[PDB]
Amino acid sequence: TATYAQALQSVPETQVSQLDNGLRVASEQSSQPTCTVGVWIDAGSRYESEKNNGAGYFVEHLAFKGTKNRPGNALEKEVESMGAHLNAYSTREHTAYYIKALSKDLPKAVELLADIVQNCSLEDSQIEKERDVILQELQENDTSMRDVVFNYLHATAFQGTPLAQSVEGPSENVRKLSRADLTEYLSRHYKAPRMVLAAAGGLEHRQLLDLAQKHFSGLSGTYDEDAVPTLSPCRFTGSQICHREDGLPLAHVAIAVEGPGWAHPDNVALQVANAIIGHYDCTYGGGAHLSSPLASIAATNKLCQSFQTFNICYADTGLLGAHFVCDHMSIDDMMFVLQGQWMRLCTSATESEVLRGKNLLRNALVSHLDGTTPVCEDIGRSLLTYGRRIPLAEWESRIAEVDARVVREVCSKYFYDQCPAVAGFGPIEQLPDYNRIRSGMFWLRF
Amino acid sequence: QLARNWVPTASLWGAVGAVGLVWATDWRLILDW
Amino acid sequence: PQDLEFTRLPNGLVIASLENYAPASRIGLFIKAGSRYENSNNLGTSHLLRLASSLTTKGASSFKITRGIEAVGGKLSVTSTRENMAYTVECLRDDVDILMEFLLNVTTAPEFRRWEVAALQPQLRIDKAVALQNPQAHVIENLHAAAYRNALANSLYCPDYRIGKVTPVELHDYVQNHFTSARMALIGLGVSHPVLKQVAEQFLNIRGGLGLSGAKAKYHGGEIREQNGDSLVHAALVAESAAIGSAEANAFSVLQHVLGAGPHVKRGSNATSSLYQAVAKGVHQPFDVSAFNASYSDSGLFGFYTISQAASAGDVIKAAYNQVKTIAQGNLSNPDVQAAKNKLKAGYLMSVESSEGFLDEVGSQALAAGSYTPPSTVLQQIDAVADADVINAAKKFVSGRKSMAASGNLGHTPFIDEL
Amino acid sequence: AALQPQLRIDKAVALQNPQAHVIENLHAAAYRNALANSLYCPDYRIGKVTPVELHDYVQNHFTSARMALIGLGVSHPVLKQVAEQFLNIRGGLGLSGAKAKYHGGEIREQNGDSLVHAALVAESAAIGSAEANAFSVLQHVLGAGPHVKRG
Amino acid sequence: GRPLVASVSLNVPASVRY
Amino acid sequence: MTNIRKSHPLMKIVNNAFIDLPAPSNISSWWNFGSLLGICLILQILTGLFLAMHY
Amino acid sequence: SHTDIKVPDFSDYRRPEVLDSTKSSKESSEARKGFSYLVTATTTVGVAY
């Protein structure tokens, strides 16, 4: 049946296989007519040099412009021949190439896919075309303020690290960019073991690996070096950044402090504190009777339009903080509230509200787990993160670990009397000076 | 609701007052050095 | 685990159930009442009603309710369209009973407290606004008016003089008017039938009354052009399509994938769509065209929604429209259709494979049929489409009264008389 | 800049009269281009207008061919004097490309009045014609302005 | 094209889609 | 203004004649006197009092 | 465009402990801050006397 305890038990398990040249293989059988076929690569901007900045990004567009065996636009005209959707995306710490398809024609898919991973048509016809679009887009990118401030946010904390830099990279490089340097980074980090493969669907494991087998047993896809594994712990900057522009109607805010990396015990312990403190938006039907003190007040006096809290844990790093939007005269009061919640947690919190947080995260956890692609998608990062580990039922056990002291003792570390980072975007001016925020981190006991 | 925390904190502030209070007047006592 | 179990009642309300193994345990509740069922003085009610969700039941104070769902960790949802409003809720495998019980009290036990009703007056706009970020949003709503007279022409949103207009009572009737145990349909997912089967008949047997179907929407075309400040004019051309649940509805559903391009590849301008290609060839730099097909119970509409720049729109329309002619003239590619069939079948299954989406797909059949059809049968029926069908299907869109909606800077904007 | 606020308050008071709002819509329904042009500012057009845009339309549509001056109580020669003096400028003139292209249709706005207002029009003829007179006669057939109070 | 579309109100999130 | 402890007696809202009273950035130690003046005076009152006590 | 911005160097006014780009700033951070406060507190003892 479906019973929460038993519900953990029966799931198609994590599968793993390993080829010779460093490629990883893995899978799970969902008993489904379709399969998400995907690839995840850990080559980051944090690898990328100061010219390489944004190049892989530029590269990202290029694959589908045609390839070696398949010149321009011969690539998709086979893809849509099947009617299988196709998509690709990248990130500072990862890049994911993937396919969503019926399990039938997969024998082409990966073979189609494997071609793309390395064999590529590098043709300055597409280059200039794509060189333009990005430049076109580079300027357009000022239209969504959300992404904008985060760029400021990193650069203010991580200044002096490749992690602190634009994903698309600065503009002039894109013009200056030449496809040989790509071929470098093409050659550099697209080797295995850097490469990782997974999939989920009616596929099981074997019948994946056999038809994994030889390209990309393989086409090398190698293992040599690129030194090893070139990375560094990044510096964390108590600081502030402000772009003051008063014309605009509203002013975003972001505030955060650094935290533990991907792999780390406490990462889960802090999953709940956010869920507990929750979030608010203009548009809810929750009104003023919600349990979240923020969603209660921020709806009550509409001290903000909306806000949400984020977590981002890098390899070695993690990011805890919120993002809110409030009236140009309403900024202060959002804050003096927001320091209330974090601070009061670190001392006076209570096991009751723990539970309501506890349940939610269980739900959200179980929730996201439906669907081919997301299932498929966990593996790739997880592999690049914790390896094969999909400790599904364990996560539950992990949930049972968290305690009142725990959360307090955890937050005591990462909040009480620290140096926060401050990002801002106009019409900021109301926003108090740092020296307030700083004194405002540690209570005086009030 | 049985507030658990703040019990030790108050334990300081009380000792914060009393000592300094004794410190204000400073009368008959035991240890010198 | 166990496959689709759907059960007629004496009330005729289908209680459909499956058994899952998953700890996610959800339930959903469908109702026939859409915007078409609002009257001239009843306007926006459902749209307002759709914000009646969180309010004070007759079974409990809304406070207790709201603090109830969170501390449990469950989640509530509400959804409507021009036709079928749907009340969705979900929580952990274990606790559904507490939550499930409240699903009733809302739909079972209404209370409209004149004070509690007032605070929701401010709310509509801020909701109503954010939907109109998307220009296409505003464009669509206008369209149903142009092509109809009465029913589907009804907005999903509140015309603004209608704002202060709505009393608790007006709601209160439409509550019980359009509610009945004949129309109500309940769907379980992760929960066993008998538990589902139990309480279903218990509370949910009420009347009777009113499904009132007097809305045939009477397709009546025309065109509407709003003068606006956008640089990218938006427009669409529609000759009425057929009713839902028909090979024609499939034929157009096939006919779309002919021209109709959703991107199957990121950023890729879809070449297999001749429409964009046959356009983009003779045409100049940015623009977009996609084909619009939608059907409701009694009927639906087929069209294509264009986005272009100031001068281009007509030729953007015309060529594409002229390109439509090409198809209507006896142009055919069986493999393309075949590929399109492959697209559709996949696109269908890729659509359906999603449970929550399929959760709708369950009751979307129910209020329509009340039975279940394996997608296989669909996939079979997908095959059943003849080409001359899709041939003459497009011919219809050419062969019949057509309608336009246009908004933006209109200086160069042609009418349908230019067409 | 100070005249930007002003338009609406003006523009509003004209729409007290429902018939007012009704008429303006009508020219659109019956035409396409010219007469369809409002006598009032569509509201996104508000912040739109620069001094220059004005400044051209000033001199674009001004000419001593189009300009016409009428005296009433004053002798011609005084009138006759200064007229030629200042008012001789260009030229440029008169932009007649608007034929208004009668193109019918119908428009229905959904509103909150108890008294619905509507009109039916088949195009009449040009000004300055016996037909224009014929309708000007044809109106007084049916057309009733009250010649007697309340009657 | 579209389904056509939908609307959403509910509680914890909020949105509109097509 | 939600739960601000500076509202409750309104007197504390008169207090924000100080703590949020803004000031330009560059200010010379030339400006420190207005402060001192009042402070020089406070002491006066007190001492000028206790005098009288034996005076 | 907007992203053309960058952070110029403040290393000058800094002190060497976290000055490195590759270091966990937390290492000194404990000892780092306490210097600032040790001043602050000791200032007070005098005032009190």
Side-chain angles (χ1 to χ4, degrees), chain A residues 1-28 30-446, chain B residues 1 3-33, chain C residues 1-206 208-419, chain D, chain E residues 1 3 5-17, chain F, chain G:
Chain A
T1 184
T3 297
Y4 175 73
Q6 298 175 336
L8 290 172
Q9 296 304 102
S10 64
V11 170
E13 64 185 343
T14 300
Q15 292 297 104
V16 175
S17 292
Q18 295 299 321
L19 290 180
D20 299 343
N21 54 347
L23 174 59
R24 296 184 186 175
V25 175
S27 63
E28 179 178 357
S30 176
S31 176
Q32 185 173 354
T34 63
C35 54
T36 297
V37 178
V39 176
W40 289 263
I41 302 97
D42 58 348
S45 66
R46 68 181 306 177
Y47 294 135
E48 291 184 350
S49 68
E50 289 184 350
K51 185 178 174 62
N52 296 132
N53 198 342
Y57 170 80
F58 178 82
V59 172
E60 183 177 2
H61 310 79
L62 308 179
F64 303 89
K65 296 180 173 73
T67 187
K68 180 56 178 171
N69 294 338
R70 297 177 181 83
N73 72 43
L75 178 60
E76 62 180 341
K77 295 176 182 174
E78 176 61 19
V79 176
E80 295 176 349
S81 300
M82 302 174 185
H85 293 289
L86 170 62
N87 184 334
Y89 69 92
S90 178
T91 312
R92 297 196 188 182
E93 280 178 339
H94 303 292
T95 304
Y97 302 141
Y98 65 96
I99 305 168
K100 292 174 296 300
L102 297 171
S103 62
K104 297 175 181 176
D105 299 349
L106 168 66
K108 300 184 179 74
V110 178
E111 297 180 351
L112 295 170
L113 176 60
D115 179 5
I116 298 168
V117 177
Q118 295 175 337
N119 290 281
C120 297
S121 64
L122 300 180
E123 301 169 352
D124 285 343
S125 298
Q126 296 299 319
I127 295 300
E128 302 307 316
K129 302 178 183 76
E130 188 63 22
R131 172 168 288 110
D132 303 346
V133 176
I134 302 305
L135 292 170
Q136 178 178 352
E137 292 172 349
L138 291 173
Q139 190 178 359
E140 296 171 348
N141 293 335
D142 296 345
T143 188
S144 175
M145 293 174 284
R146 175 172 182 165
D147 302 343
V148 174
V149 61
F150 295 106
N151 301 339
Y152 301 85
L153 181 60
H154 300 85
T156 311
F158 296 156
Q159 61 182 23
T161 59
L163 181 61
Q165 69 189 18
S166 171
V167 180
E168 294 186 349
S171 65
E172 53 188 341
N173 293 342
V174 173
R175 298 174 185 170
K176 299 175 179 178
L177 185 60
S178 177
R179 63 183 186 83
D181 299 345
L182 306 181
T183 303
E184 304 169 350
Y185 180 76
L186 290 173
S187 299
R188 294 172 189 170
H189 299 85
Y190 295 147
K191 65 177 180 179
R194 299 292 184 190
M195 294 177 63
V196 166
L197 174 65
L203 270 66
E204 283 77 2
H205 183 55
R206 179 67 60 185
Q207 70 171 17
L208 162 62
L209 178 62
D210 55 357
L211 60 77
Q213 188 52 255
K214 295 167 305 307
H215 304 293
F216 301 92
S217 284
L219 181 62
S220 73
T222 68
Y223 172 78
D224 287 345
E225 295 306 323
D226 279 349
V228 162
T230 57
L231 295 173
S232 295
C234 297
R235 182 186 60 199
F236 299 153
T237 308
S239 61
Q240 173 173 345
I241 176 170
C242 299
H243 177 198
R244 176 183 179 175
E245 183 275 336
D246 284 338
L248 287 173
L250 295 178
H252 291 75
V253 177
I255 176 173
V257 295
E258 303 92 0
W262 286 106
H264 189 280
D266 297 345
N267 182 27
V268 175
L270 289 175
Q271 295 302 326
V272 179
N274 282 338
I276 287 174
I277 303 300
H279 54 78
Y280 170 75
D281 181 5
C282 306
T283 56
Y284 305 151
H289 298 292
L290 296 174
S291 63
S292 176
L294 292 176
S296 67
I297 295 299
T300 298
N301 297 339
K302 60 181 175 298
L303 300 183
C304 55
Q305 297 301 315
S306 67
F307 62 88
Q308 62 181 19
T309 61
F310 54 77
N311 186 342
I312 290 170
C313 293
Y314 285 142
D316 52 353
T317 309
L319 291 180
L320 297 178
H323 165 54
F324 66 93
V325 171
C326 56
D327 178 8
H328 67 281
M329 305 307 296
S330 176
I331 283 176
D332 175 5
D333 303 346
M334 283 298 297
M335 290 306 302
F336 176 83
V337 173
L338 183 58
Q339 287 184 336
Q341 296 306 321
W342 294 1
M343 295 309 297
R344 62 174 295 276
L345 289 180
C346 293
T347 62
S348 295
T350 304
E351 301 171 351
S352 62
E353 50 198 342
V354 171
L355 304 175
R356 61 180 184 186
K358 184 182 297 178
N359 299 342
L360 294 171
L361 181 58
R362 295 183 180 175
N363 294 280
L365 170 60
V366 176
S367 175
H368 177 58
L369 301 178
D370 189 6
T372 309
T373 301
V375 170
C376 179
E377 185 172 1
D378 178 12
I379 317 300
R381 177 182 59 204
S382 301
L383 287 169
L384 277 64
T385 308
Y386 295 95
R388 60 177 181 184
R389 298 180 181 176
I390 312 301
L392 178 60
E394 176 180 1
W395 289 99
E396 183 281 338
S397 66
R398 300 179 180 177
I399 295 166
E401 312 307 321
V402 181
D403 185 3
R405 294 186 184 177
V406 169
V407 179
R408 290 188 298 273
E409 295 157 347
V410 176
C411 296
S412 299
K413 297 162 59 185
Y414 297 143
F415 295 93
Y416 179 83
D417 185 7
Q418 303 306 317
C419 295
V422 171
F425 179 82
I428 302 168
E429 181 177 2
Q430 182 181 359
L431 176 61
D433 179 76
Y434 184 89
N435 289 279
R436 290 296 180 84
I437 296 173
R438 178 58 179 80
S439 295
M441 290 303 294
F442 71 98
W443 281 2
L444 201 137
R445 298 296 178 269
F446 68 86
Chain B
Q1 184 62 266
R4 180 184 176 278
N5 302 334
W6 291 90
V7 174
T9 293
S11 64
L12 291 179
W13 290 100
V16 171
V19 177
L21 176 58
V22 284
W23 179 84
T25 299
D26 281 62
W27 14 261
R28 62 217 112 124
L29 50 79
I30 303 169
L31 63 85
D32 288 347
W33 58 272
Chain C
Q2 297 301 318
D3 289 345
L4 278 72
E5 178 182 4
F6 64 90
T7 299
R8 297 297 310 283
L9 291 185
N11 301 130
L13 70 93
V14 178
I15 52 174
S17 64
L18 280 70
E19 181 178 3
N20 192 336
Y21 59 94
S25 180
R26 71 171 67 198
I27 292 173
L29 165 58
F30 295 0
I31 291 170
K32 299 172 185 170
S35 64
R36 76 170 66 199
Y37 301 99
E38 293 180 353
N39 190 342
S40 295
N41 299 283
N42 194 32
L43 296 174
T45 301
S46 64
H47 174 61
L48 171 63
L49 170 64
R50 187 179 66 204
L51 294 174
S53 63
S54 63
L55 307 184
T56 298
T57 59
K58 177 180 56 57
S61 63
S62 180
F63 164 80
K64 185 179 177 63
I65 298 169
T66 302
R67 291 294 174 84
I69 289 175
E70 292 185 351
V72 172
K75 177 182 177 182
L76 183 145
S77 295
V78 170
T79 302
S80 67
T81 180
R82 296 188 179 279
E83 188 62 20
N84 292 339
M85 184 175 284
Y87 298 135
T88 306
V89 73
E90 181 281 334
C91 65
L92 295 174
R93 176 58 178 166
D94 297 345
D95 294 345
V96 176
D97 289 342
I98 300 100
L99 185 67
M100 168 180 68
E101 176 177 358
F102 292 157
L103 171 59
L104 300 173
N105 300 282
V106 174
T107 183
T108 306
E111 285 182 351
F112 304 150
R113 294 179 184 171
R114 63 179 68 85
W115 59 100
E116 296 176 353
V117 179
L120 188 62
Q121 299 298 322
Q123 184 56 59
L124 287 171
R125 294 183 181 176
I126 298 171
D127 184 8
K128 183 178 180 181
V130 299
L132 292 186
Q133 293 182 338
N134 306 344
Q136 63 174 19
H138 188 283
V139 175
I140 296 300
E141 293 302 320
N142 302 343
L143 183 65
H144 301 79
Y148 293 98
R149 300 181 61 179
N150 44 340
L152 291 175
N154 296 339
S155 173
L156 300 175
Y157 291 86
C158 180
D160 302 348
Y161 67 85
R162 174 67 180 168
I163 287 172
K165 182 171 179 180
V166 180
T167 69
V169 175
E170 295 164 347
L171 301 168
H172 189 69
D173 298 345
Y174 182 86
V175 175
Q176 57 190 21
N177 299 338
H178 290 77
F179 290 168
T180 186
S181 297
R183 295 175 62 182
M184 290 185 283
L186 175 57
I187 307 301
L189 179 65
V191 180
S192 67
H193 184 200
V195 177
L196 164 64
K197 185 178 173 61
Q198 178 184 355
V199 67
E201 297 172 350
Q202 181 173 354
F203 296 91
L204 290 174
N205 190 30
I206 294 99
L210 189 148
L212 173 58
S213 63
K216 63 191 185 71
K218 183 182 176 292
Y219 170 83
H220 179 276
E223 62 180 340
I224 302 167
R225 299 170 65 253
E226 176 183 359
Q227 187 61 64
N228 289 336
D230 183 353
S231 67
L232 300 178
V233 60
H234 301 171
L237 174 64
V238 171
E240 178 186 359
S241 69
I244 192 168
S246 295
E248 293 181 350
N250 191 342
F252 293 96
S253 299
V254 174
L255 172 60
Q256 54 179 17
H257 290 288
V258 182
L259 298 181
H264 303 289
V265 179
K266 174 170 288 301
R267 295 182 180 86
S269 67
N270 297 337
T272 302
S273 292
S274 300
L275 181 63
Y276 178 77
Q277 302 306 318
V279 169
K281 293 168 182 176
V283 172
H284 199 68
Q285 293 179 333
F287 62 94
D288 180 6
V289 176
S290 176
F292 177 79
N293 187 28
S295 180
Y296 293 94
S297 63
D298 58 353
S299 178
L301 302 175
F302 172 78
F304 58 99
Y305 169 79
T306 61
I307 295 171
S308 64
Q309 298 180 339
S312 299
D315 302 347
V316 170
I317 295 167
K318 295 176 184 298
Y321 173 67
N322 302 336
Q323 176 53 59
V324 174
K325 302 172 180 175
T326 304
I327 301 169
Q329 295 164 337
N331 186 341
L332 171 60
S333 299
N334 305 131
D336 299 354
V337 176
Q338 183 58 58
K341 291 181 176 180
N342 305 337
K343 301 172 184 175
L344 172 60
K345 295 173 179 177
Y348 173 83
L349 298 174
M350 295 187 286
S351 302
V352 175
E353 61 184 343
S354 60
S355 66
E356 180 177 2
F358 172 75
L359 175 66
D360 179 6
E361 180 62 17
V362 176
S364 70
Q365 292 181 335
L367 296 180
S371 65
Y372 167 70
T373 297
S376 62
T377 304
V378 178
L379 300 171
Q380 299 171 336
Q381 296 163 333
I382 293 172
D383 185 12
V385 177
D387 293 347
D389 183 4
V390 174
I391 294 299
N392 194 28
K395 293 180 62 62
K396 178 194 292 180
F397 178 85
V398 178
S399 177
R401 186 181 186 175
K402 284 177 293 300
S403 61
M404 184 184 287
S407 295
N409 182 340
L410 298 177
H412 302 164
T413 302
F415 305 164
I416 61 174
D417 294 344
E418 294 74 350
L419 305 178
Chain D
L3 188 62
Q4 299 298 322
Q6 184 56 59
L7 287 170
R8 294 183 181 176
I9 298 171
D10 184 8
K11 183 178 180 181
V13 299
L15 292 186
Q16 293 182 338
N17 306 344
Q19 63 174 19
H21 188 283
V22 175
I23 296 300
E24 293 302 320
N25 302 343
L26 183 65
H27 301 79
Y31 293 97
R32 300 181 61 179
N33 44 341
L35 291 174
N37 296 339
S38 173
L39 300 175
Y40 291 86
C41 180
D43 302 348
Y44 67 85
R45 174 67 179 168
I46 287 172
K48 182 171 179 180
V49 180
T50 69
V52 175
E53 295 164 347
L54 301 168
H55 189 69
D56 298 345
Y57 182 86
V58 176
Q59 57 190 21
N60 299 338
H61 290 77
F62 290 168
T63 186
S64 297
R66 295 175 62 183
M67 290 185 283
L69 175 57
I70 307 301
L72 179 65
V74 180
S75 67
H76 184 200
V78 177
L79 164 64
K80 185 178 173 61
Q81 178 184 355
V82 67
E84 297 172 350
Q85 181 173 354
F86 296 91
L87 290 174
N88 190 30
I89 294 99
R90 299 288 182 267
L93 66 94
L95 301 180
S96 63
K99 63 191 185 71
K101 183 182 176 292
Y102 170 83
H103 179 276
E106 62 180 340
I107 302 167
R108 299 170 65 253
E109 176 183 359
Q110 187 61 64
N111 289 336
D113 183 353
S114 67
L115 300 178
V116 60
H117 301 171
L120 174 64
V121 171
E123 178 186 359
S124 69
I127 192 168
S129 295
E131 293 181 350
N133 191 342
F135 293 96
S136 299
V137 174
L138 172 60
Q139 54 179 17
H140 290 288
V141 182
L142 298 181
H147 303 289
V148 179
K149 174 170 288 301
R150 295 182 180 86
Chain E
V5 303
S7 68
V8 177
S9 296
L10 46 69
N11 189 32
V12 172
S15 64
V16 173
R17 291 170 299 177
Chain F
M1 182 172 279
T2 303
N3 286 280
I4 287 300
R5 300 188 186 180
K6 300 175 181 177
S7 299
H8 308 292
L10 182 64
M11 171 185 71
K12 300 170 183 175
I13 286 173
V14 174
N15 185 33
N16 288 346
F18 289 167
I19 290 170
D20 291 354
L21 169 59
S25 295
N26 54 342
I27 291 168
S28 296
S29 66
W30 290 105
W31 274 269
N32 278 276
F33 298 93
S35 297
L36 294 169
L37 294 174
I39 299 168
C40 301
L41 176 63
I42 300 297
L43 178 66
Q44 278 300 324
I45 307 168
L46 307 173
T47 299
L49 172 60
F50 293 167
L51 298 174
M53 290 184 174
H54 301 283
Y55 172 72
Chain G
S1 177
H2 65 292
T3 53
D4 182 66
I5 56 97
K6 59 182 176 297
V7 175
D9 179 16
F10 301 88
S11 64
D12 298 349
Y13 301 87
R14 307 188 190 177
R15 54 180 181 182
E17 296 176 351
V18 299
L19 178 58
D20 180 1
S21 300
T22 57
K23 297 307 288 184
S24 173
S25 301
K26 292 182 66 65
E27 297 303 322
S28 299
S29 294
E30 175 60 17
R32 175 180 62 196
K33 290 197 294 186
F35 178 74
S36 298
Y37 293 150
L38 177 60
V39 182
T40 299
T42 305
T43 299
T44 304
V45 170
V47 179
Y49 171 66

